[PDB]
């Protein structure tokens with residue numbers, strides 16, 4: 190989903206920014222003179238195919254001219270696959286690394302300051318609102334991939350990772366894949382969307398028979414994700430539970446958890462604006478709503494969720510920008 | 514698991530404190546003049562048996578005298594099963610209600626101040642240590658089905674500052690449906706035997722090395738179940754126990770940090786003298802605070818609310 194941006198092409202270098210995660214490898218590049226930023230994603234585990242795509246991009250978008258190509262790598266793979274990369278691209282101007290947290294922040298900051306129609310709020314009440322993007326700072330980034338990293342940015346170039354969590358997209362995809370046997374992330378999202386978590390979850394209402402306003406929770410609030418199930422090829426003979434219900438429950442469970450940790454991190458760091466990055470939302474309305482509600486709920490309106498059109502490309506984008 | 518205590522039998526009343534939670538129904542009482550505190554737990558699912566037990570207790574330890582029995586009920590069951598309670602005890606001295614967070618805190622604070630050998634620390638390196646102002650402020654992480662978190666800054670100054678739906682229920686639920694484990698006990702056996710890297714993506718899997726710039730070694734868990742969408746039940750168990758326990762750990766740390774708290778007491782039905790769990794929770798606290806915060810555990814971790822209700826009669 191290309192972006193129009195006036196790039197500086199003064200050094201006549203074709204910059205291939207790659208971000209090789211645990212699961213997803215992202216590429217950001219701009220054919221010289223195009224004023225277009227282009228983005229692809231392929232699985233990390235298809236490492237061969239990832240390299241074919243890289244050669245293919247040089248072939249088609251830079252006239253097969255290796256000598257003018259600079260590879261800039263970020264994410265774990267910048268170390269882990271560096272040798273393989275150096276070996277597979279003998280003729281390039283060079284392959285260099287850019288630090289992962291710097292990349293994320295550099296990419297996000299760029300989108301926040303330079304790309305119209307990139308940053309948006311979303312809940313079910315309000316719909317989608319595009320932001321017309323130094324009341325920027327400080328801001329939080331919650332980067333949801335397989336796992337979750339949380340970074341603060343106090344000002345341009347001043348950032349740090351303040352924490353993270355092992356309960357991310359990878360937990361969601363993994364649990365629901367094994368349990369319900371969904372084959373796509375899309376399919377589990379559709380299953381979630383039409384499901385009912387109250388079949389598998391304990392609500393406050395189940396415990397109290399009513400609201401619990403003294404602690405600020407309604408009957409419908411979730412007390413225990415999957416709380417009803419102990420209290421009741423393999424799992425198919427295990428299952429007495431609706432797959433869509435399971436998918437809903439676990440999507441709420443993980444999102445709400447991310448929401449809470451984001452909130453707590455924002456709290457500590459006196460941040461109002463929370464940006465969600467990574468591969469997790471994917472413009473999925475329910476997901477964005479759950480995240481926005483969690484932030485709103487915990488902050489009582491005082492803090493705000495934000496999403497990004499190019500949410501999965503923060504790292505690769507930052508890497509790209511470093512090669513200036 | 515009786516505590517011996519010098520109670521005030523000033524009212525001459527048999528005070529029967531109950532805390533009916535979502536899964537667990539708890540009871541604390543003292544036979545008059547015994548100076549004994551007694552504790553039983555029955556599943557909420559078996560509410561009828563819990564009711565039968567309350568009758569039993571009155572018959573056995575208060576001499577069949579309903580007239581001098583005062584029930585103090587807390588937990589959501591005090592609301593949801595009010596009708597059953599009144600139906601069971603129309604003729605007792607009173608059925609009082611005590612608010613649940615106040616009961617938790619009153620229970621905890623009494624155990625911290627008054628009962629020797631109740632509060633301990635535990636990890637794999639140092640073993641169990643019994644602890645014998647410097648008390649406040651403190652945190653309570655109450656884990657049953659879900660999680661409540663409370664801050665207590667002075668004797669009668671506390672609040673629930675947040676909570677989590679990812680509790681023991683999430684663990685028992687996923688592990689029971691995925692693996693087939695019968696009991697919380699047999700999850701810990703499976704987990705004891707387990708290697709989580711089978712299903713968890715580690716830092717070392719992503720970087721081929723440490724990421725010490727962010728303070729994470731190659732063996733740190735980047736994504737629980739992160740290998741699963743590209744399986745040994747022991748591995749699953751250990752993965753999810755880490756997943757849930759570390760999360761609770763992190764959230765406890767963050768809440769403690771927001772509130773400038775050093776000491777974090779765990780209550781509920783989750784630790785239950787399970788060494789691994791207690792180690793996991795301690796380590797998370799340790800890790801996130803670089804050793805400057807501390808997990809504490811309680812011999813009667815499950816009875817905080819009943820205990821606080823019991824004390825409200827006093």
Ligand SMILES: CC(C)(C)c1ccc(CNc2nc3n(n2)C(=O)CC(CN2CCCCC2)=N3)cc1
Pocket residue numbers: 211265289336337338351352353354355716719720724727728729733734735736800801802
């Ligand atoms: C892909 C990449 C970047 C390697 C990665 C790694 C891990 C995760 C998510 N997992 C995670 N993140 C954490 N985790 N676990 C902890 O256990 C503690 C923690 C903070 N801790 C650091 C040391 C000082 C004390 C505070 N941050 C996401 C992405």
Ligand SMILES: CC(C)(C)c1ccc(CNc2nc3n(n2)C(=O)CC(CN2CCCCC2)=N3)cc1
Pocket residue numbers: 393396397401404405406410411412413445486487488489535589613659660661674675676677678
């Ligand atoms: C049994 C009993 C006591 C009924 C119970 C209920 C819920 C849970 C766990 N679930 C949970 N706890 C939360 N949750 N979710 C939230 O979503 C938000 C939240 C705090 N929020 C409320 C409004 C002001 C800002 C802070 N506390 C455990 C035990």
